[PDB]
A paper describes a structure:
We have unraveled structures of the soluble components and the pore assembly of the YaxAB cytolysin from Y. enterocolitica. The crystal structures show an atypical fold, comprising a head domain reminiscent of ClyA family toxins and pronounced coiled-coil and foot domains unique to the YaxAB system. In line with our finding that the isolated YaxA and YaxB head domains form spoked oligomers in solution, the YaxB head domain in isolation was sufficient for recruitment to membrane-bound YaxA.
Because our PaxB model could be well resolved, missing merely the N-terminal 11 residues, we will utilize these coordinates for most structural analyses throughout the manuscript. Strikingly, a deletion mutant of most of this domain (Δ265–284; Fig. 6c, lane 11) did not co-sediment with membranes. YaxA, bearing a membrane-binding domain at the tip of its coiled-coil stalk, associates with the target membrane on its own. For YaxA, rearrangements in the head domain remain modest compared with the monomeric protein (RMSD of 1.1 Å across 259 Cα pairs).
Numbering used by the authors: 44 to 160, 163 to 409
Write the structure that this text describes.
């Protein structure tokens, strides 16, 4: 069944949804960016989803109050139907069995109300009235319970996705959070960043490799001084050239590295924002999945309760003037039996609300 943790998880999801920023500049401050250049993750995209979550959270208390008040109402409705049904059965069973088996319900109602006057006329009229009132009462509880179930179902489908009772189809807030979360992961830079770090270190070692070979070749260029004048011309030309090839290649890589470190710095910036947004969407999504499970329980409970009321209503429709009174008592028992289940479930739900409210004090 729907438990107190289920109700607390709904309140926790609503509180998270209402705390989401919805103003565009606040969503941007929350994201840490004005543009990310990933489809579906731009601040306008995130705001649209936060607006939908916020509106859904705003709508919980209408459902919550309908659920709790309907449980309070069905509690005392079940109690009244069972006790009044039992009183009616007891009244009938005061008739001797030799008469009960052959007397029809119409004999103790309609056939007393067609002629002219009686005490049995008044009680027979009151018996006909209380049956009519109970029939209408059970129809009313079916109608209101169907509406509560519809509110819970629509609240659930808004979270899961699907077709609402209005016929509108909605994508589902939880699958939408999941899509964006998946886009953040398809967009991750961690491997790109690591391969760029690797190339900065490697070119930052080669820049140093022939700073030493520049110092070598320029030393080598002087080793014509052994011969003197034209041995220095040939050592100067050959090794002076190899020394500049090393310097030129060096200056291409110092420019290369400054670019690559600017690039990797921006890729790290994107990753940091992705990781932050991922964590927020994970928190939202966990709150949603717990709320969804809570609503699965609540929806199933209200479908089951509605089914019991409908069972009672169908049995009540079988009561008619031509039932022998022994058959009537058996059918009236079949009318009130489903209401034990309805009342037990309704009282259980009221008590879960009570225990969920008390949980705050027990924790703090």
């Amino acid at each position: 069944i729907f438990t107190k943790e289920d109700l607390i998880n709904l309140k926790l999801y609503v509180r998270k949804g209402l705390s989401l920023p919805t103003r565009q500049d606040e969503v941007e401050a929350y994201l840490g960016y004005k543009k990310i250049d990933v489809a579906g993750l731009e601040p306008k995209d995130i705001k649209l989803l936060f607006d939908e979550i916020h509106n859904h959270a705003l709508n919980w208390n209408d459902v919550e109050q309908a659920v709790l008040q309907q449980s309070l109402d069905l509690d005392i409705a079940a109690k009244n139907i069972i006790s009044t049904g039992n009183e009616i059965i007891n009244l009938i069973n005061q008739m001797p069995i030799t008469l009960r088996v052959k007397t029809l319900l119409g004999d103790i109602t309609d056939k007393q109300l067609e002629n002219i006057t009686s005490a049995d006329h008044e009680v027979a009229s009151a018996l006909k009235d209380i049956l009519d009132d109970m029939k209408g009462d059970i129809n009313r509880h079916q109608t209101t319970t169907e509406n509560v179930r519809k509110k819970v179902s629509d609240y659930r489908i808004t979270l899961t996705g699907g077709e609402l009772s209005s016929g509108d189809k909605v994508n589902g807030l939880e699958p939408q959070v999941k899509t964006k979360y998946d886009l953040m992961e398809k967009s991750n830079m961690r491997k790109s960043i690591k391969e760029l770090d690797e190339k900065i270190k490697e070119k930052r070692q080669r820049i140093e490799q022939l700073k030493k070979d520049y110092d070598k070749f320029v030393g080598l260029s002087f080793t014509g001084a052994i011969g003197g004048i034209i041995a220095m011309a040939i050592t100067g030309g050959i090794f002076g050239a190899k020394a500049e090839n090393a310097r030129k290649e060096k200056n291409a890589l110092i420019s290369e590295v400054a670019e690559l470190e600017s690039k990797v710095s921006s890729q790290r910036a994107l990753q940091t924002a992705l990781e932050a947004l991922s964590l927020s969407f994970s928190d939202i999504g966990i709150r949603m999945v717990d709320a969804e499970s809570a609503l699965n329980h609540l929806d199933f409970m209200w479908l089951s309760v509605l089914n019991q009321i409908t069972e009672s209503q169908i049995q009540f429709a079988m009561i008619n003037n031509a039932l022998r009174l022994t058959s009537f008592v058996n059918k009236f028992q079949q009318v009130i039996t489903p209401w034990q289940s309805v009342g037990d479930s309704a009282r259980q739900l009221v008590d879960i609300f009570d225990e969920a409210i008390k949980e705050y004090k027990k924790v703090y």
